[PDB]
Amino acid sequence: RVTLNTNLSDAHIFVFKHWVIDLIREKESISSIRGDLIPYLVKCQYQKSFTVRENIQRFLSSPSSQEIKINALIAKDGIICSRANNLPNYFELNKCIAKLTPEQR
Amino acid sequence: KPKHALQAIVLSDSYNYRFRPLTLDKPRCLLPLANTPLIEYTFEFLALAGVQEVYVFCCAHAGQIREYIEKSKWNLPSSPFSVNTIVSRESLSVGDALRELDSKQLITSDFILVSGDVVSNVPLNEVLKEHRKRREDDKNAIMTMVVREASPFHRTRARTESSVFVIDKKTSQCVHYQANERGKHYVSMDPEIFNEHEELEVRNDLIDCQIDICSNDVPALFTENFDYQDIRKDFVYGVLTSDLLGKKIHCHVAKENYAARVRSLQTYDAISKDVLSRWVYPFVPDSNLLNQTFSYQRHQIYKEEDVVLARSCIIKARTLIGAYTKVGDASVVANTIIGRNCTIGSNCSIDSAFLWEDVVIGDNCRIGKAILANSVKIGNNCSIEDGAIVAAGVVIGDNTIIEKNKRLTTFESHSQGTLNDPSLVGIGGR
Amino acid sequence: DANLQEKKIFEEKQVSIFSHLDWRRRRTTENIPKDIHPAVIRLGLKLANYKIFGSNQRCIDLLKTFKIVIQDYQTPYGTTLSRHLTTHINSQIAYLVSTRPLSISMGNAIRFLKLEISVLDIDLTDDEGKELLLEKIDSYIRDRIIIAGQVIVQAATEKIQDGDVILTYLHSSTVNDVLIHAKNVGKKFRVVVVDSRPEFEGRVCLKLLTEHGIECTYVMISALSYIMQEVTKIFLGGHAMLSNGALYSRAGTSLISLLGHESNVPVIACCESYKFTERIQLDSLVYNELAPGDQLVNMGVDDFEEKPGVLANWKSVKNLKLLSLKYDVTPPRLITVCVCEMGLLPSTSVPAIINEFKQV
Amino acid sequence: DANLQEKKIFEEKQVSIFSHLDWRRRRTTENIPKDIHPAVIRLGLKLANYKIFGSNQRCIDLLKTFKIVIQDYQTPYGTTLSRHLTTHINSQIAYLVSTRPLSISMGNAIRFLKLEISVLDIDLTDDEGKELLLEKIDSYIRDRIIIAGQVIVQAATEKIQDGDVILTYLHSSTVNDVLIHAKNVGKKFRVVVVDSRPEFEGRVCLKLLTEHGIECTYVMISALSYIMQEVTKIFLGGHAMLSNGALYSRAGTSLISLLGHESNVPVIACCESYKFTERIQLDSLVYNELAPGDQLVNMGVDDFEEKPGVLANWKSVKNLKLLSLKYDVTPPRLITVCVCEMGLLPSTSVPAIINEFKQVY
Amino acid sequence: SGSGCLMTRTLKNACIPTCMVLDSAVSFTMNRVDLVLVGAEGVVENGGLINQIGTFQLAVFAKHAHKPFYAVAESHKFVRMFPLSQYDIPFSRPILEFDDPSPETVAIHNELIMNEEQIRNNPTLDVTPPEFVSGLITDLGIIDSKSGVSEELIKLYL
Amino acid sequence: GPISEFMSTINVEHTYPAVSSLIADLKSRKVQGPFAVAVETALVMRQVISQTRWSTVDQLIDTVRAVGSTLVKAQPTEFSCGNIIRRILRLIREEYQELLKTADENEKGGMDMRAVIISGIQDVIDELDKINTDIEVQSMDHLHSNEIILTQGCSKTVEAFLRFAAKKRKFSVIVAEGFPNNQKGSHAMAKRLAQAGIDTTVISDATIFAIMSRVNKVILGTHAILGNGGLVTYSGAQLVAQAARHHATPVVVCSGIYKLSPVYPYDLESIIQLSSPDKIMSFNEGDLISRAEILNPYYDYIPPDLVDLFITNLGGYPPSYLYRIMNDTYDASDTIL
């Protein structure tokens, strides 16, 4: 059961487990986080044969901290709201600024 | 009240083949499920929907089909609908019936269409209101497909019913559809639907009962596009690809009640277990719609009145026994349905089998996962492994073993069957 | 705050027999203090948003978390480890309490951990005091919980007999580990799984047992009268055993026991020792714990889904208020045995075992 | 005013359990209406001031009084007797109820007499109508009570066995009338007389049985556990038997039956048939009648002997109230037999007997 | 009465499994039984059940075991008597008396029983009060109220 | 002795069609619930009487019985069917014996009583729309202010029972939804009880034992009452009675009389009915629905020794007096149909 929206934009708010930073050091072919890293992560989520390496797990990355509680799977979720959350790339600057008037006097 | 009577046509003979070794003696739409002919399961479904005028296409055994209907309960004035039968060419393909339909100009308004025989208990009275509404503002609403929420690996979801739908989560409009085939590795659709749809939902959890709610134009449309043969691989595909011009279809995913179609060998078994298990209430033996004498017993055991249950015979769970049927001593039955007036020997072992009207089994017989048609006899010391299928009249000699899937027959086709005993390594008729 | 709140929390002593049951919950980290170690917060969320959180696993994860707290603790070297450490811990439970009331499996563990704090010698340095506590906790986990479970599993399996048909209710990971261990030793039997609204905790016991190849049946609690005729024994894992002999477990646990007694079937209670308590209740309303009433609004057979109940305004409708307790007290005369790691004891023999440990 | 009072009688449904029980009693002749017959006055005084007023003698004196009322009634010339007579009588009841609530015995008598007035033949005359129902009344006193009593006592004394130890409680004239019989028929037995506060009705039972030469034993209700070990049978006279099989008698009657059954003694209920009621009571609090609370202030072994106590100002001290219910119901699982004039019946068989008399077509 | 040795035969001659149980072992038997059924030598105003000596013995076990207790009785056995306790019945012979001695010194053991003199001291009959009988099977139908036994009984004696 | 032994299934459809149409509606649960069954059972026999021709009375009582015997095996558990039949049978042989005598009384064969039976049938139909309206008034002798009450699932009879008290007395009731089968209507009832000024609280079915400790009375509505005073009631009611008796809490049953039936509960397993498991576990959990046994009964039997009071259209009556309501309403010849 897969739902998918189209009128959705990124907000560039990502929160990562620590271990992913070592992946960024190794996998040099990652230029933009939003452009490259996220889809890289989502492919590995379900693609079976796409299991080049999970070694960047259980390597004493400290998730208990001696026996793993989160190994056989890598997860990644999304979250949506209703108002006041975007990022300027030109045309927003006119708008996000206008949106920035819940001020007073 | 009129309501254009609400018509409904039933496409029998459409899936007449896959039940091959038996359908040549009597058609699929009349063989028993839980000691009850299929079309009855379909009819009471139709009546549940408020249908008032039914037309049944027939090709194989159109006589004994109609003869049953004529003497059925549905030919009475108490019936809620007036069933008429229709004959056409043998091995009838969908649409070719629809084309023959409007050539008779007998479709008045919105109707339902069923390709085969269906067990179900979903009240469509809500689906039509769903259908007839969004149509009254967009006369290009053509077909409303009703489907059942389920698991991807559900026992009641096989290849033909295994499909992938893409629906507008707001208005429930199937914008893309494709069947699941070993090899079809990807799901591909032109993205221009995204520019016309905000919130889509890709679902592989459906069933596709193929109980579509068809509009008024559909038959005439099938005559305009004479190429369309299959309602799922020719019709809808043409609508989604804009072959048929500027028309929409909609999906109604039911989340409660039950719906499925008796179509394949790997479904008759499944659905039997699904109606024995009370999934299709009230359509259960305990209702006795045809004046049977069934009664629910614990662990899903169903018996009729006047049944010879020998002491020291052990009846396990999930089984069903018709009336006038005898069972020997030290015999064991489990997860098998049994037609009326059968006769089971002594010191036997049955499991996962299916027995029909008046069948005779000798002493010391072992059976499993086998279909035993009407009026067949088995000698003593025999044994039948899984997958076996025998037709009527067939009789097996004593001290014999029928291998798996070894379908038999009492007729003159290519199948290995022949009646008299012994009938495996010892051969009759060849 | 608490000065004014304590008057509020007392003004709630009026007509509603549930007026005293505290309903206040902190489900977010909004306005959270700073004294709070991360691993405590991650637990505070799990305490408030998880719903299949066994009474054991909480006490485990609580203590394991407490280890990290004490490890990462930095005592003010203007003092020593002993003084100003419970005060640090005390300021952690107050958060952890506000996210969900303390179980009985947790309080006694906390009540114990606070003692070993107060008794260790001052000669030890802080790095010595820590490493000591870490041992006592790890021992408390193995001796009082895990091993005790492994004993109960065996002893309970003994009274299982081939041909039995036993009844569990609402996923007690202890009584699952029995049934699981019961099939592996080859005991021939089958299971009845009684579930109930709102959070059908049963259909996960059905999942586990089925994934182990166990014959099982699934009926809601309103089918007890119909299904008890098949059952032969009843197995219950409790949240705690009171000192009167009563079994303090979840909702229908009483009706399970009561209906069984009125059908001559036994109510076997599996509960570890540390869940025992000196507390004693006459009714299932004095001490209890509330759940969100909105979870009743959902009609059909699913928790969080698209069921716009006809009561979704009960918070705003006058004279209509939903509620759902989540523990209830069953008298002894229905419970026939408590199987603890000290062996199979009569439920009424609880306070002796409590006074057994209190010799220290 | 009545509706205004009816508004008051609504607000008396508050937190207190006994909010609804009616305390309004008139114990004087102040402001009496005129349409009140003298013989009714003397009665209403006896109801509110007597204390050993058995539920039987009340129904008798009520009827014998009612004869004197009807005998002296005078219908207006512009109306026959039947029309506008209950109205007169109804104006008598409303007074009598204001002195002390109607017993169940008295009530059914009202319901019966009010009926025979309706079915009364219009084609008669006054002196024809009067002289008639006076016999109907005298017949009611004959068959329904007096004879019925004489049947019960004989039917009850039959189950008295030589060597018994009988236990009665709080003076039931019927229960006294059977023990005195069992004495005079030669039965060898002895009696335990359980009494209780506040108006020690048991002494007058002790007084009677003693003057008939009966070995008696006198203990307060607090000694039930102590005294039941000698008792072998329990005799109770009821104020009424409910339709569910329960027994509606004075206060301790419930404990008497309870403590007895937990010591394997039978509870024998001696009650007439006119005291059967079509109603039922799940608790001893919905339908009942109060006594003044002041009666248990004079704590001493007396009630008239004006020797005070500590609670004399209870009416003036907040969060303090004394009460004394006069009846409670006893579940039928504790009553063993009911001794109606139709023989020894099980208490549960009451409503049939009620429906048996409704054969009055 | 020893009639048990006879009843088991009367059933066996009709292909009915039989397991004779000692009078002292009905309790152990209950959890196996689904329903207990007995005859009646006399029915009482209170809905009682005057039958053989052991009926009330197992009428209470059925109560304690929550298994239904049914009794069969013919209408020509409704008697007009009323016991107050399970003992208030007339004794043909004085029963259950004690010996008065004086200083005179004088597994399975089936042959060790009471003499024919001791037995005659023991009672012949036994009465079960109506709260222990789920229903009564009569030609008048199945009666269970135990106040309807009286209406029917009263319907007779007149 | 059913009807098919008398009339051929086809000619039944021409003589009395509504009968043949009712059986279909009766087995297919198109008409369920005892009331809906009752009223439709009556007015079907109305046309039957208005459509059969006969000479002697023994023709009818043998005919109307015969159709009933089939009209029961349609769906027997909906007991209100036979109860309307059994009451009609006495209705004629009473109107017979009264006429056969009042003609003998006129002294010193007229089957034109059909319109009397219709005037007798319509009488009992008008009694049905007068079931609660004369039952709701018994509350003010049982419900009192500040009391706490417990019920279970939708039951309009009990609903109207309380709301009448709520007119003047204020009090509190507790509702246990009849999961899984009485969930919808039960919630609605509480929402209605709130409007009437009733401190109503909705609880899970399992929360019953908890709150009973402080419950004054429990009120219950049944699906039928059997010949032993036992109760056939919608699911989950034994939980209430058993919890009540554990607290000595009085149990009250507010039911009409058309459900009172003389059939004796021999085997319970032939009484309870089993609905679809869809109401208990979703069809999606495919792994589970295959590997397990899932059952959803929607009736429940509670024995008669557990009810303390019966509120009926005739009044309050102990269970040990139900038989006298039978024999005054039915005839023992018509126990079996």
- D47 secondary structure, DSSP code: H
C vs E: CB pairs below 8 A: 5
Distance CA(D346)–CA(D309), nearest Å, equals 45
Return the residue matching tokens 């990124």: A10
Helix, strand, coil % (nearest 5) of chain A? Answer: 30, 5, 70
For residues D188 and D232, membership in a common domain is answered with: yes
Tell me if residue F296 falls in helix, strand or coil: strand
- Looking at D104, D135, D151, which one is the last position of a domain? D151
- Residue E46, token pair as written in the block: 């209170």
Q: Determine which helix (DSSP H) or strand (DSSP E) holds D315, and give its type and residue range.
A: none
- Pairing type for strands D240-241 and D247-249 reads antiparallel
Nominal resolution in Å?
A: 3.3
- Looking at C135, C151, C167, which one is the last position of a domain? C151
User: Per DSSP, what are the bridge partners of residue B296?
Assistant: B302
Q: Determine which helix (DSSP H) or strand (DSSP E) holds D233, and give its type and residue range.
A: strand D233-237
Question: Would you list the DSSP string of B247-302?
Answer: -EEEEEEE-SS-EEEE-SHHHHHHHHHHHHTGGGTTSSGGG-TTS---EEETTTEE
Query: Is E126 in contact with E57 (CB distance < 8 Å)?
Result: yes
For residues D178 and D273, membership in a common domain is answered with: yes
Query: Is B37 in contact with B30 (CB distance < 8 Å)?
Result: yes
Distance CA(A7)–CA(B198), nearest Å, equals 6
For residues B72 and B125, membership in a common domain is answered with: yes
- D253 secondary structure, DSSP code: H
- F11 secondary structure, DSSP code: H
- Looking at C120, C151, C182, which one is the last position of a domain? C151
- Residue C100, token pair as written in the block: 């969900």
Residue from E69, E139, E145, E153 to probe the interface with F (highest F Cβ count within 10 Å): E145
How many structural domains are present in chain D? 2
Query: Is D186 in contact with D193 (CB distance < 8 Å)?
Result: no
User: Per DSSP, what are the bridge partners of residue B254?
Assistant: B148
User: Per DSSP, what are the bridge partners of residue D329?
Assistant: D248
- Please, what is the angle between helix F34-49 and helix F80-104, to 10°? 40
Counting Cα atoms < 13 Å in the Cβ hemisphere of D60 gives: 13
Distance CA(D274)–CA(D359), nearest Å, equals 15
The residues, any chain, with a CB within 8 Å of residue D290's CB and separated by 6 or more, are D18, D21, D22, D23, D323, D324, D325, D326
D vs F: CB pairs below 8 A: 47
The answer, yes or no, to whether the previous bond of D38 is cis (omega within 30 of 0) is: no
- Residue B115, token pair as written in the block: 């390709």
**Cα D85 to chain centroid, rounded:** 27
Tell me if residue D222 falls in helix, strand or coil: helix
Distance CA(D237)–CA(D249), nearest Å, equals 7
Name the residue facing B194 among A1, A3, A6 (closest C-beta): A6
Which subunits count as partners of chain A given 3+ CB pairs below 8 Å? B
Distance CA(D239)–CA(D119), nearest Å, equals 29
Which subunits count as partners of chain C given 3+ CB pairs below 8 Å? E, F
Q: Determine which helix (DSSP H) or strand (DSSP E) holds E21, and give its type and residue range.
A: none
User: Per DSSP, what are the bridge partners of residue C338?
Assistant: C269, C345
- Residue D84, token pair as written in the block: 């506008």
Residue type, C116: E
* Set of chain F residues whose Cβ sits within 8 Å of the Cβ of E148: 320, 323-324
* Set of chain E residues whose Cβ sits within 8 Å of the Cβ of F264: 142
Neighbours of B130 (CB within 10 A): 16
Query: Is A26 in contact with A33 (CB distance < 8 Å)?
Result: no
Q: Which residue on chain F is closest to D346 by alpha carbon? A: F320
**Cα C99 to chain centroid, rounded:** 15
In the sheet that holds F224-225, the strands lie side by side as: F224-225, F231-234, F299-302
- Residue E62, token pair as written in the block: 């059925």
- Pairing type for strands B259-262 and B117-120 reads antiparallel
* Set of chain E residues whose Cβ sits within 8 Å of the Cβ of C258: none
Return the residue matching tokens 């952890």: C96
For residues B107 and B217, membership in a common domain is answered with: yes
Query: Is F257 in contact with F329 (CB distance < 8 Å)?
Result: yes
In this complex, is the C-beta atom of F276 within 8 Å of any C-beta atom belonging to chain C? no
Nearest-5° angle of CA F28, CA F32, CA F35?
Answer: 150
SS3 letters across chain C: CHHHHHHHHHHCCCCCCCCCCCCCCCCCCCCCCCCCCHHHHHHHHHHHHCCCCCHHHHHHHHHHHHHHHHHHCCCCCCCCCCCCCHHHHHHHHHHHHHHCCCCHHHHHHHHHHHHHHHHCCCCCCHHHHHHHHHHHHHHHHHHHHHHHHHHHHHHHHHCCCCCEEEEEECCCHHHHHHHHHHHHCCCCEEEEEEECCCCCCHHHHHHHHHCCCCCEEEEEHHHHHHHCCCCCEEEEECCEECCCCCEEECCCHHHHHHHHHCCCCCEEEECCHHHCCCCCCCCCCCCCCECCHHHHCCCCCCCCCCCCCCCCCCCCCCCEEECCECCEEECHHHCCEEEECCEEECHHHHHHHHHHHCCC
The residues, any chain, with a CB within 8 Å of residue B283's CB and separated by 6 or more, are B41, B44, B45, B119, B121, B275, B289
- Looking at B294, B312, B329, which one is the last position of a domain? B294
For residues B281 and B347, membership in a common domain is answered with: no
Counting Cα atoms < 13 Å in the Cβ hemisphere of D290 gives: 19
Query: Is B121 in contact with B280 (CB distance < 8 Å)?
Result: yes
Closest CA to D132 of D85, D169, D181, D173: D85
Return the residue matching tokens 């299959």: B230
- Looking at B262, B294, B326, which one is the last position of a domain? B294
* Set of chain D residues whose Cβ sits within 8 Å of the Cβ of F145: 13-14, 19-20
Q: Are B76 and F14 in contact (CB < 8 Å)? A: no
The residues, any chain, with a CB within 8 Å of residue C29's CB and separated by 6 or more, are C41, C45
Residue type, A67: E
Domain with B172, as residue range(s), is 1-294
For residues D184 and D270, membership in a common domain is answered with: yes
- F304 secondary structure, DSSP code: G
Return the residue matching tokens 């400290």: A62
- Pairing type for strands D343-345 and B326-327 reads unpaired
Distance CA(D72)–CA(D67), nearest Å, equals 8
Q: Are D280 and F318 in contact (CB < 8 Å)? A: yes
* Set of chain F residues whose Cβ sits within 8 Å of the Cβ of E47: none
Closest CA to F212 of F126, F139, F152, F270: F152
For residues B323 and B250, membership in a common domain is answered with: no
For residues B280 and B388, membership in a common domain is answered with: no
Query: Is F284 in contact with B151 (CB distance < 8 Å)?
Result: yes
- Looking at B294, B309, B343, which one is the last position of a domain? B294
Distance CA(A61)–CA(C119), nearest Å, equals 36
For residues C119 and C170, membership in a common domain is answered with: no
Tell me if residue D103 falls in helix, strand or coil: coil
- F80 secondary structure, DSSP code: H
C-alpha distances (whole Å) from B134 to each of B111, B171, B177, B213, B221 are: 15, 9, 21, 13, 20
Distance CA(D108)–CA(F35), nearest Å, equals 37
Which bin fits D290, alpha (ψ -120 to 50), beta or left (φ > 0)?
beta
Q: Are E144 and F319 in contact (CB < 8 Å)? A: no
Counting Cα atoms < 13 Å in the Cβ hemisphere of F47 gives: 15
For residues D131 and D237, membership in a common domain is answered with: no
Nearest-5° angle of CA F107, CA F109, CA F114?
Answer: 120
In the sheet that holds B308-309, the strands lie side by side as: B308-309, B326-327, B343-344, B360-361, B377-378, B395-396
For D215, phi and psi rounded to 5 degrees? -60, 120
Distance CA(C323)–CA(C33), nearest Å, equals 31
Residue from D158, D333, D344, D354 to probe the interface with E (highest E Cβ count within 10 Å): D344
Q: Which residue on chain E is closest to F303 by alpha carbon? A: E134
Closest CA to D59 of D274, D264, D235, D229: D274
For residues B282 and B373, membership in a common domain is answered with: no
Name the residue facing E142 among F264, F319, F322 (closest C-beta): F264
Helix, strand, coil % (nearest 5) of chain E? Answer: 30, 15, 55
For residues B71 and B205, membership in a common domain is answered with: yes
Query: Is D11 in contact with D278 (CB distance < 8 Å)?
Result: no
Query: Is F130 in contact with F111 (CB distance < 8 Å)?
Result: no
Closest CA to D284 of D347, D330, D238, D324: D330
- Pairing type for strands F224-225 and D328-330 reads unpaired
For residues B302 and B410, membership in a common domain is answered with: yes
Q: What is the CATH classification number for the domain harbouring E119?
A: 3.40.50.10470
* Set of chain D residues whose Cβ sits within 8 Å of the Cβ of F309: 244, 280, 282
Distance CA(D236)–CA(D258), nearest Å, equals 13
Nearest-5° angle of CA D201, CA D205, CA D206?
Answer: 110
Radius of gyration for the alpha carbons in chain A, expressed in angstroms and rounded: 18
C-alpha distances (whole Å) from F223 to each of C177, F35, F155, F230, F307 are: 41, 10, 9, 11, 15
In this complex, is the C-beta atom of F197 within 8 Å of any C-beta atom belonging to chain D? no
For C263, phi and psi rounded to 5 degrees? -135, 20
Domain with D63, as residue range(s), is 1-151
* Set of chain E residues whose Cβ sits within 8 Å of the Cβ of F322: 145
Question: Would you list the DSSP string of B77-101?
Answer: TTSSSEEEEEE--SSPPTTHHHHHH
* Set of chain F residues whose Cβ sits within 8 Å of the Cβ of D21: none
Distance CA(F114)–CA(F109), nearest Å, equals 13
For residues B219 and B279, membership in a common domain is answered with: yes
Return the residue matching tokens 């509680």: A69
- Residue C146, token pair as written in the block: 């895990």
Closest CA to B83 of B138, B135, B151, B8: B8
Closest CA to B30 of B420, B419, B373: B373
- Residue B20, token pair as written in the block: 């091959």
**Cα B217 to chain centroid, rounded:** 27
User: Per DSSP, what are the bridge partners of residue D270?
Assistant: D237
User: Per DSSP, what are the bridge partners of residue A5?
Assistant: B199
In the sheet that holds B383-384, the strands lie side by side as: B366-367, B383-384, B401-402
For residues D81 and D161, membership in a common domain is answered with: no
Name the residue facing C222 among F210, F235, F294 (closest C-beta): F235
For residues C125 and C164, membership in a common domain is answered with: no
For residues C213 and C238, membership in a common domain is answered with: yes
- Residue E79, token pair as written in the block: 């008697």
Question: What was the elucidation method?
Answer: X-ray
How many structural domains are present in chain E? 1
Distance CA(C306)–CA(D247), nearest Å, equals 56
- Residue E80, token pair as written in the block: 């007009």
Closest CA to F143 of F118, F164, F115, F157: F164
Return the C-alpha torsion angle B353, B359, B363, B364, nearest 10: -20
Tell me if residue D235 falls in helix, strand or coil: strand
- Residue C111, token pair as written in the block: 């009540």
**Cα C156 to chain centroid, rounded:** 20
D vs E: CB pairs below 8 A: 33
Distance CA(F42)–CA(F83), nearest Å, equals 10
- Pairing type for strands C337-340 and C343-345 reads antiparallel
Query: Is B272 in contact with B167 (CB distance < 8 Å)?
Result: no
In this complex, is the C-beta atom of C165 within 8 Å of any C-beta atom belonging to chain F? no
Tell me if residue B175 falls in helix, strand or coil: strand
Radius of gyration for the alpha carbons in chain F, expressed in angstroms and rounded: 22
Distance CA(E76)–CA(E153), nearest Å, equals 10
Domain with E149, as residue range(s), is 1-156
The answer, yes or no, to whether the previous bond of B422 is cis (omega within 30 of 0) is: yes
For residues C159 and C63, membership in a common domain is answered with: no
For residues B138 and B277, membership in a common domain is answered with: yes
For residues D4 and D104, membership in a common domain is answered with: yes
In this structure, chain D runs to a length of 361
Radius of gyration for the alpha carbons in chain C, expressed in angstroms and rounded: 22
Q: Are E84 and D336 in contact (CB < 8 Å)? A: yes
For B7, phi and psi rounded to 5 degrees? -80, 170
For residues D110 and D237, membership in a common domain is answered with: no
- D142 secondary structure, DSSP code: I
Distance CA(D32)–CA(D5), nearest Å, equals 18
- B306 secondary structure, DSSP code: S
C-alpha distances (whole Å) from F331 to each of D291, F93, F227, F310 are: 50, 10, 13, 22
For residues C119 and C159, membership in a common domain is answered with: no
- Please, what is the angle between helix D173-184 and helix D55-72, to 10°? 110
The residues, any chain, with a CB within 8 Å of residue C257's CB and separated by 6 or more, are C234, C236, C247, C267, C330, C334, C335
Residue type, F331: D
In this complex, is the C-beta atom of F77 within 8 Å of any C-beta atom belonging to chain B? no
Question: Would you list the DSSP string of B13-79?
Answer: STT-SSSHHHHTTS-GGGSBSSSSBHHHHHHHHHHHTT--EEEEEE-TTHHHHHHHHHHSSTTSTTS
Distance CA(B68)–CA(B71), nearest Å, equals 5
C-alpha distances (whole Å) from B136 to each of B140, B212, B247, B335, B345 are: 9, 18, 14, 49, 63
Query: Is D263 in contact with D228 (CB distance < 8 Å)?
Result: yes
- F315 secondary structure, DSSP code: E
Q: Are F322 and E145 in contact (CB < 8 Å)? A: yes
C-alpha distances (whole Å) from A60 to each of A19, B351, C216, D289 are: 10, 54, 41, 82
Name the residue facing F332 among E135, E141, E147 (closest C-beta): E141
Neighbours of D233 (CB within 10 A): 20
The residues, any chain, with a CB within 8 Å of residue C282's CB and separated by 6 or more, are none
Closest chain D C-alpha to E132 CA, distance in angstroms = 12
